Each structure stands twice: as C-alpha cells, then as structure tokens.
Amino acid sequence: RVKKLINSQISLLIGKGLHEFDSLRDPEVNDFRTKMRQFCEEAAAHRQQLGWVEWLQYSFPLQLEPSARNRALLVNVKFEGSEESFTFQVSTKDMPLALMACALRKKATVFRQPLVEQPEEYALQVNGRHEYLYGNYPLCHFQYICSCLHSGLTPHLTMVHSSSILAMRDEQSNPASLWSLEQPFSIELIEGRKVNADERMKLVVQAGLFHGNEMLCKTVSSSEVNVCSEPVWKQRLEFDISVCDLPRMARLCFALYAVVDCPIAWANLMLFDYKDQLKTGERCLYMWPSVLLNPAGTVRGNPNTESAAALVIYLPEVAPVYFPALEKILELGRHGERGRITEEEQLQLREILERELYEHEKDLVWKMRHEVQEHFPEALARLLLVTKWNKHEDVAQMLYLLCSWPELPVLSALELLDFSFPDCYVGSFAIKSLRKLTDDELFQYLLQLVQVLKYESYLDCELTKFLLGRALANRKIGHFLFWHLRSEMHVPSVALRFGLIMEAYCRGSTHHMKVLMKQGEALSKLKALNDFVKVSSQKTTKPQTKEMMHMCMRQETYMEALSHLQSPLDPSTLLEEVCVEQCTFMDSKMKPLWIMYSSEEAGSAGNVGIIFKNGDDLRQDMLTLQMIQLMDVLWKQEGLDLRMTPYGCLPTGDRTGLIEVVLHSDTIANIQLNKSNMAATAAFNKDALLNWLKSKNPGEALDRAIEEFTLSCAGYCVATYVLGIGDRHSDNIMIRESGQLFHIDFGHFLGNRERVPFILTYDFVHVIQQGKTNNSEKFERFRGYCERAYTILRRHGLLFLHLFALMRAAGLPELSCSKDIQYLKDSLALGKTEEEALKHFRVKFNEALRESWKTKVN
C-alpha cells in the first residue's frame, strides 16, 4: 500500500518511471538496485537511532568560517514557543553554551523559577533558517555570526530543546584460468544496421583496445565496404595482444565512418562483464552519433534503439573464464627483483620524481618501483603511468606494491580518480584515501566527484557507494548530490546511472524525497510561468506582462507550489511567503524570473530571492562560481578576506537552473547611466560610481565601503585573470550597497581561444584612489592585495589542476582538452619559482595599468 505510493513518488521526483528499470531485464541493473537498496536502508535505520546532537549534525551540519576548520556582540534570543525575546551583549569569543546559559538566567528571572533545564539540553537555531549554532566553537567562528558582524546586523537565535529536535528525528523516519590463454585477442565484425551516409563513399570500422587513454595495442581497421543501410563485413579483426594479458578494465572501442574523413558513430564495451567474466557470444552495439576513436565515452549502448546505427560483433569463446582473484594476482606479484643500483642512479630518480618523461626514464622508474613505494609514496601516479598495463606480469607486480601502499593525502587521491587511472584497485585505493575528507571538503569537490561517475565502467562501484554513504550521513551532501544527478536526467548516456543512484538515495531518505518533490513541484510551476512570460512579452508591454505574471502566480496552485519550501540553492534557506508584488523578470532573451520571498520568523534574513532561468545552460556558470568560492576559501585560510560574493548557481534540469539573488546590488552599467534627479547624479561620469557609494554609505560609512570595493576588486581581478574569463563589460559586473564588487554571466573562461590579459578598469581605479587622480598609498595597497591573492593561489596550483582535470568528464565545450588545462598552468605560472612568477605577474599587472591609462589620458 505504501510501496506503491513511494515507488510512484520516486518516479515523479527522478523524472523517470521505475518500471523502465525492470523492463530492461538486465541483471547488473537489478543487482545494483537490490544491493544499493539494502545499503541505503541500513544508513536510514542507523540514523533513526542517532543521538539528538548527532541528528543536528546530519540535518543541520555546521557552517563554519574557513579559518575555524575580545569584542562586544549584541544577540537576540527567544525560546521555541515564545513571542517575547531577550537582547543581551555577549562576546565574539564566547561559545554557544555560555550564551544559552545566559538565556536561561534571563528566563529564570522573567518566569520567577530556578530552571531544571540546563544549557547542555539545547541548541541555538538561526531564526527562520535550517541552520543551527552548537559545539565548542566561539561565536565569531560560525558563518552566520561572522556575516552579522560585517553587515552590522544583530543575530536572532532561538533556543530549541533536545525533545523538540528528537520529535523532528521521529517525524522524519522512513516508513515502518585467464592466464593460461596465450592466444591472440580478436573479434568478428559481422554487420551494421540503420547506417546513414553519402552513397558515393565507402564505410570503414576502426577498432582499438584501451586501458583508459592508452592503447593496449595498435588500432585495427575493417575492409572498406560500400555505403548502405545494412553494411556487412563477416571478418576477423585481430589485435596484437594475448587474451591472457587483457587487463580487468580493458575496453574495446569502435568507430564507424565514411571515407572517399566523414565520422558517423562510435561505441565502446568492456571486455569483461560486471561479475568479472570474459565476454562471449554476439553483441549488438547501439552506436552514439559522432562529432575519431572515443575511449572516454560510455561503455553502454545508445538507449534510442529505434534510430541508432547498430554494429553487430562476435566475441569468440576462448574455452566461463573469469578475471583471476586478487589472491591469485598478489601471489604472482609477490615474486620480483628489487632496486639495487648506485646513488648516481638514485640521483636521477630523485630529480624526475620532484619536477612527462623519456623512455629511458620510464625503465628507470619501473626498475626502482620498490624505492618509490617506500621513499616517494606520493609518486604512485607517475609509476602507475609507466606500468605496462598490456602485460599481466607487470600489472600483478604493480598491484602487489599498491596493495600495501600507505594512504595518500587528499590532493594525491583527487589525481587518482582521473580517467588516466582506470584500474579498479587503483580507484578503490584512491577512494580509501578520500574517506578522511571532511564534509566541508567533500562538499567543495562534490561537483567533480559527480562527473567522475561518468568515467565509471560499471554501475556498482566504490565511488557510488562512497557518495551515497556520505549523502545519507549529511543532508546537505544528500541535497546537492540529488540535484547534480537530477539536472542530468535529460542526457541519455547518464540517465540510467543517475536514475539508479537517486532511487537508492530515496530508499535511504523517504522524508527528504518528499522535501525534494516539494522543490521539483515549484520548479515545474516556474517553467510554465516562465513559458507564459516568454509568450506574453513578445505581444504586450512589460508592465502588462508583469501583472499577467502576478495574476498567474496568485492562483491557488501557484501560491501553494511556490511557497514554504527549502531553497534548492541552499537547504539552510527557507523560501516562505512569495512576495508576488516584488516578483519580476529581466528583458534578456530568456526572460529570467526574479521570485521574491519573505518570512516573519526570520526577519531580514528571510527577505531572499531566487532567479529561475530556462533557455541557457548554467553548468559553466556554476563551475566558475565554485572555483571563485574555492579561491575565497583558500585566501581566508591564509588570513586574507577579499569580501567575495559567491552567490549560488544551480542547474536543476534541461537548460534550466537557479541563481541566488544578491539584494541591494546593481550593475556598473545601471549606475553609470547617470540618471537625472538621483542621490548620485554627477558633473563627470567618472564620479557616478563614487557618488552612488556616498549616497548608500553616508559620512563615516564611505571609508569602509571604499575598502570593501578595493578588497573585492583585487579578488575579482585575480580570479578573472587566473580563470581567463574575458568579455567583461559594465553590464556583467555588479556592486553591492556595501561597496562590494562582483561578477555575473560566466559564458566564457580559460581564454576561450585568446589569452585574456590582466584587466584594470579606470572606473574602479578611480574608486580605489578615493576620487583622487594620484593616490599611490591607496593604489599600491590594492597591488599588494592582488599580489597576496595571486601568490596564495599558485601554492594551490595542483588542487585547481586536479579539479579541472576531473571536470573534463562534464562535456563542457570550453573544458575538453589539455589546451584548456594548459591555460591554468600558464595563468598560475606553475612551471616557475615564486620570485619568477611574481615578476611575470607584476609585468602583466603593469601592462594592465598602462592599458587603464589609455582611458585616463582622454
């Protein structure tokens, strides 16, 4: 009775009927669903018995300042079921417990009674948010308390008792031998079906065996056969590699095309199956349309069988042959010769492991494999790349050393997740080194780890199991894992994989399924409302379309679907009462909607907005914003706060997503229109930005507003330089009423292919110099902020390179080659010393200042 309801709710949420999984009749698919349902149900049961503070860590994980991983402060505290409140002055050095004990002493006098309840029995909720303050941390270490200190504002907190937290826990419960086959590997290319090509040309089928990116042997080609719907070959394609040497993760890649170079289609398959057995019999390869051989592409067929070209191939029977077990492998690898040559050979080893290498260096690194294991364990990735994956004796010797390799730092593990390391044991070892990842680090890299699933050869994998277990133990990780997979359900290549992961997650959290369905319902109404706006705007004037939008939002179905929800941009932010009168849309092509919200419980923190966008792909905006946010995190860990504005951006479906509204901000273009009869009207357009800051920050407040601008300007000058974000104009640069500058519209990065120089804009130099023509004291403090920021990022150059390497899996047009990653290597000057990189940065900066002065001359 309940299972039918749950299965139908899951189908609605994931945007794919669960019947379609059963209809495929695939054992791998069914075994993933049964095994992952059990694993996710175990996590759910574990959770229901968690202690009330452990339930807070699951649902409301702490939001701390990067540096946390004296001064007076006025706090307002109320109790859960109360109307009255208490305002008291505490210190930024005090912990929540002291503030809770202070709230209980203020309440004991108000209610004339010695209280039984101790501070230890409570937690402090941020008013109107899914956010809590708890644990041994001083108040200023929390992100909510710190943001309140900058904005001037007073924190509003609520004392929630343990019994009420336990009641939430309960309300949210889930309802009640291969090595003896030395023959050569070969296949039979039988025929092709539904093929479309120019009849003047001839069809060719190119095939190659790969272990990730490297070929296990040279490619082979079919005999040229005349173009037609059903081409027929019936021929053996013999590859030079023994069937016994085929590594476990070997994949046979296909490419059909026409020749006189006209690509048609590609398809890949794993030579071994998910249960480790060698593949035999006939296989029908439903091909993917091209734009030659594509190894990184999926190893599963195009689900569109009614229109896809299908290559028919035969995998011959070499004898049921499974891949040897790890004990057989470790026995074979247990025998070898160790490294034993002079300190002059070890000097060459030490030089090449601390600096792409020549063939004699590969023979040196492999010979000294035992010494790299014990004296340079972090060089595992170099050694794995020199390993001959096309010789089974060499794979067993490598796996023997890997099986007792010490756990590596997170930075090294993020490299091992790359597609250039397709061995399952290597991936398993990499995941083992990532378990020590804090929920905050995991969240930071969650987008990349989701893309790595696209490289996975099989459905059931250590990465999937790891991502699902971290999602079920932290509701914020769960929320974003769901949205990263949900937003890709319109992509045929990942819909099966992602749909199965979301169904499994849903088995672990039935309550959270209902929470996300409530978000999905709101996004449906937003698509329909946006569609109406697009239509109405091409016929009537903006005021008339805005009121028609408001009339549509005012219907019961819209008011119910759009209110009282968790923000998909941030589960801590509750979107309560939609303020229809404040809602509007922009005039650009896709007419993005601005939906305004408010909450009487939250006060000023409940006044939030979201932007629904349908028509543009938001993946790259998100990635760029996340990179900027990573920068701000890294700068803050070195004590450098550059007043960044990392607003949320989240794709949610096909060319659909949400952007977070940053209120009290306008574009440079709108400020520079120099409207008549304003608090900012100027004698010279050069003054407009500075007059606008003066109007927003009167008297003594201007000084701090100018410093906010300088700091954020320095951060964005460096961030856009490093990331090669060009096409910067006055309409994609915004400024906050506090002085903070930020960037929007990230359609182009990594120089995509010009080399984006450092940009210094005169208008911003004029604000930095406080309105003065010459102000070296203010200008050079800004060049210092730029230099500190640049030099802190270079020290993390490998973290950006590893993260961007994992991102090549996303299929982003401006992030699909070594040329794109090369761009960051140049911008961060990673091939140089710090002194040399700083001189090059100064020369880039001085060139930007000279360019800025071509506008200052006129």
Ligand X SMILES: COc1ncc(C2=CCOCC2)cc1S(=O)(=O)Nc1cncc(C#CCN2CCN(C(C)C)CC2)c1
Report if residue 579 touches ligand X, rule: CB under 6 A. Answer: no
Report if residue 594 touches ligand X, rule: CB under 6 A. Answer: yes
Binding mask 595-624 for ligand X (x = CB under 6 A): ----------------x-x-----------
Report if residue 121 touches ligand X, rule: CB under 6 A. Answer: no
| Cβ proximity to ligand X, 728 vs 825, nearer residue | 728
| Cβ proximity to ligand X, 670 vs 852, nearer residue | 670
Q: Which span sits near ligand X by CB under 6 A: 449-457, 475-483, 580-588, 701-709? A: 580-588
Exposure on the CB side of residue 273, measured as CA atoms within 13 A: 15
Other beta carbons less than 10 A from residue 105's beta carbon: 14
| Cβ proximity to ligand X, 366 vs 594, nearer residue | 594
Instruction: Identify residues after which the chain is interrupted (C–N over 2.5 A).
Output: 69, 176, 260, 291, 319, 355, 752
As a whole number of angstroms, the distance between CA 497 and CA 35 comes to: 15
Instruction: Work out which of 580, 662, 678, 799 binds ligand X, going by CB under 6 A.
Output: 662
Parallel, antiparallel, or unpaired: how do β-strands 72-79 and 577-578 relate?
unpaired
Report if residue 648 touches ligand X, rule: CB under 6 A. Answer: no
Specify whether the CB–CB gap between 551 and 592 falls below 8 A.
no
Specify whether the CB–CB gap between 158 and 601 falls below 8 A.
no
As a whole number of angstroms, the distance between CA 257 and CA 206 comes to: 8
As a whole number of angstroms, the distance between CA 435 and CA 413 comes to: 10
Dihedrals φ, ψ of 593, to 5°?
-90, 135
Helix H or strand E segment including 86:
strand 86-91
| Cβ proximity to ligand X, 50 vs 662, nearer residue | 662
Report if residue 678 touches ligand X, rule: CB under 6 A. Answer: no
Dihedrals φ, ψ of 297, to 5°?
-55, 155
Instruction: Work out which of 661, 760, 809, 829 binds ligand X, going by CB under 6 A.
Output: 661
Q: Which span sits near ligand X by CB under 6 A: 112-120, 352-360, 544-552, 658-666? A: 658-666
**Interactions with ligand X, residue window 177-196 (CB under 6 A):** none
Q: Which span sits near ligand X by CB under 6 A: 93-101, 442-450, 657-665, 847-855? A: 657-665
Report CA-CA distances (Å) from 213 to 127, 218, 242, 268, 799: 52, 13, 19, 13, 22
Conformation bin of residue 194: beta by default, left when phi > 0, alpha when psi is -120 to 50: left
Range 206-228 burial, b when 16+ CB lie within 10 A, else e: bbbbbbbeebbbebbebeebebe
Q: Which span sits near ligand X by CB under 6 A: 40-48, 226-234, 541-549, 656-664? A: 656-664
Q: Which span sits near ligand X by CB under 6 A: 19-27, 72-80, 492-500, 583-591? A: 583-591
| Cβ proximity to ligand X, 433 vs 620, nearer residue | 620
As a whole number of angstroms, the distance between CA 776 and CA 68 comes to: 35
Residue 799 beta carbon to ligand X: minimum distance, rounded to whole angstroms:
26
Instruction: Work out which of 345, 393, 666, 707 binds ligand X, going by CB under 6 A.
Output: 666
Report if residue 584 touches ligand X, rule: CB under 6 A. Answer: yes
| Cβ proximity to ligand X, 107 vs 696, nearer residue | 696
Q: Which residue has the tokens 């050393």?
A: 401
| Cβ proximity to ligand X, 156 vs 613, nearer residue | 613
Strand order in the sheet with 310-315: 232-242, 184-193, 310-315, 281-286
Report if residue 822 touches ligand X, rule: CB under 6 A. Answer: no
Parallel, antiparallel, or unpaired: how do β-strands 72-79 and 156-161 relate?
parallel
**Interactions with ligand X, residue window 740-759 (CB under 6 A):** 744-745
Residue 847: both structure tokens together: 């060139």
Residue 709 beta carbon to ligand X: minimum distance, rounded to whole angstroms:
17
| Cβ proximity to ligand X, 211 vs 736, nearer residue | 736
Residue 645 beta carbon to ligand X: minimum distance, rounded to whole angstroms:
7
Q: How many residues does the chain have?
A: 858
Report if residue 647 touches ligand X, rule: CB under 6 A. Answer: yes
Residue 689 beta carbon to ligand X: minimum distance, rounded to whole angstroms:
15
Q: Which span sits near ligand X by CB under 6 A: 12-20, 475-483, 531-539, 655-663? A: 655-663
Residue 607 beta carbon to ligand X: minimum distance, rounded to whole angstroms:
13
Q: Applying CB under 6 A, what is the total number of residues that bind ligand X?
A: 18
Report if residue 73 touches ligand X, rule: CB under 6 A. Answer: no
Q: Which span sits near ligand X by CB under 6 A: 173-181, 186-194, 662-670, 827-835? A: 662-670
Q: Is the dihedral of CA 375, 377, 382, 388 positive or negative?
A: positive
Q: Which span sits near ligand X by CB under 6 A: 49-57, 475-483, 538-546, 582-590? A: 582-590
Specify whether the CB–CB gap between 572 and 589 falls below 8 A.
no
- Tally helices (H) and strands (E) across the chain: 31, 27
Q: Which span sits near ligand X by CB under 6 A: 171-179, 336-344, 581-589, 804-812? A: 581-589
**Interactions with ligand X, residue window 428-487 (CB under 6 A):** none
Residue 731 beta carbon to ligand X: minimum distance, rounded to whole angstroms:
5
Residue 663 beta carbon to ligand X: minimum distance, rounded to whole angstroms:
8
Instruction: Work out which of 110, 325, 586, 843 binds ligand X, going by CB under 6 A.
Output: 586
| Cβ proximity to ligand X, 298 vs 645, nearer residue | 645
Residue 92 beta carbon to ligand X: minimum distance, rounded to whole angstroms:
29
| Cβ proximity to ligand X, 243 vs 611, nearer residue | 611
| Cβ proximity to ligand X, 748 vs 802, nearer residue | 748
Pick from 445, 466, 443, 442: which is nearest to 456 by CA? Answer: 466
Amino acid occupying residue 345? E
Specify whether the CB–CB gap between 492 and 656 falls below 8 A.
no
Report if residue 164 touches ligand X, rule: CB under 6 A. Answer: no
As a whole number of angstroms, the distance between CA 683 and CA 704 comes to: 24
Parallel, antiparallel, or unpaired: how do β-strands 310-315 and 741-743 relate?
unpaired
Instruction: Work out which of 23, 173, 555, 588 binds ligand X, going by CB under 6 A.
Output: 588
Report if residue 592 touches ligand X, rule: CB under 6 A. Answer: yes
Report if residue 641 touches ligand X, rule: CB under 6 A. Answer: no
As a whole number of angstroms, the distance between CA 583 and CA 503 comes to: 35
Chain CA centroid to CA 414, Å: 13
Residue 696 beta carbon to ligand X: minimum distance, rounded to whole angstroms:
14
What's the CA angle centered on 558, arms 554 and 560, to 5 degrees?
105
SS3 per residue for 271-308 = CECCCCEECCEEEEEECEECCCCCCCCCCCCCCCCCCC
Specify whether the CB–CB gap between 216 and 246 falls below 8 A.
yes
Using only C-alpha atoms, the chain has a radius of gyration, in whole angstroms, of: 30
Q: Which residue has the tokens 């202690």?
A: 51
| Cβ proximity to ligand X, 249 vs 734, nearer residue | 734
Report if residue 731 touches ligand X, rule: CB under 6 A. Answer: yes
| Cβ proximity to ligand X, 286 vs 647, nearer residue | 647
Report if residue 667 touches ligand X, rule: CB under 6 A. Answer: yes
| Cβ proximity to ligand X, 314 vs 594, nearer residue | 594
| Cβ proximity to ligand X, 551 vs 663, nearer residue | 663
Report if residue 665 touches ligand X, rule: CB under 6 A. Answer: yes
As a whole number of angstroms, the distance between CA 756 and CA 723 comes to: 9
- Using CB under 6 A as the criterion, which residues of the chain lie in contact with ligand X when the complex forms? 584, 586, 588, 592, 594, 611, 613, 647, 659, 661-662, 665-667, 731, 734, 744-745
